């Protein structure tokens, strides 16, 4: 869920709040197309892109299905209790907070005007 993804990312990126990651680009957050703007962003289109499939799942709701994960030591796992919905939305989200960790942030990226921007 959400609050779960939250956590993903505090824990790959403690360097940042991570409300930064919510708002930013063509496709992180709220946003959901156009040309991604940079890295992080298309880390973001995956990442949005990967729970449309999951949502393909029966009763799958990616920001609301609880998953079963860990973050220790530097690495997150989604665990071996996860059902076919749950192994997806976690696989997302852990992919996506490995991928925020390692792009670039803009500050200019940050709130862009998506109905001008993200056509
Ligand atoms: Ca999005």
């Given at each position: 869920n959400l609050?779960?993804?939250?956590?993903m990312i505090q824990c790959t990126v403690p360097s940042?709040?991570?409300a930064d990651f919510a708002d930013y680009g063509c496709y992180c957050?709220?946003?959901?197309?156009?040309?991604?703007v940079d890295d992080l962003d298309r880390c973001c289109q995956?990442?949005?892109?990967?729970?449309?499939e999951?949502?393909?799942i029966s009763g799958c709701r990616p920001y609301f299905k609880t998953y079963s994960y860990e973050?220790?030591?530097?690495?997150?796992?989604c665990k071996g209790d996860n059902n076919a919905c749950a192994a997806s939305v976690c696989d997302c989200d852990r992919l996506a907070a490995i991928?925020?960790?390692g792009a670039?942030?803009?500050d200019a990226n940050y709130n862009i005007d998506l109905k001008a921007r993200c056509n």
């Open positions: 609050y779960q993804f939250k956590n940042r709040s991570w957050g709220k946003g959901g197309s156009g040309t991604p995956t990442h949005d892109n990967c729970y449309n999951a949502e393909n973050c220790t030591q530097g690495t997150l796992t991928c925020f960790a670039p942030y803009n």
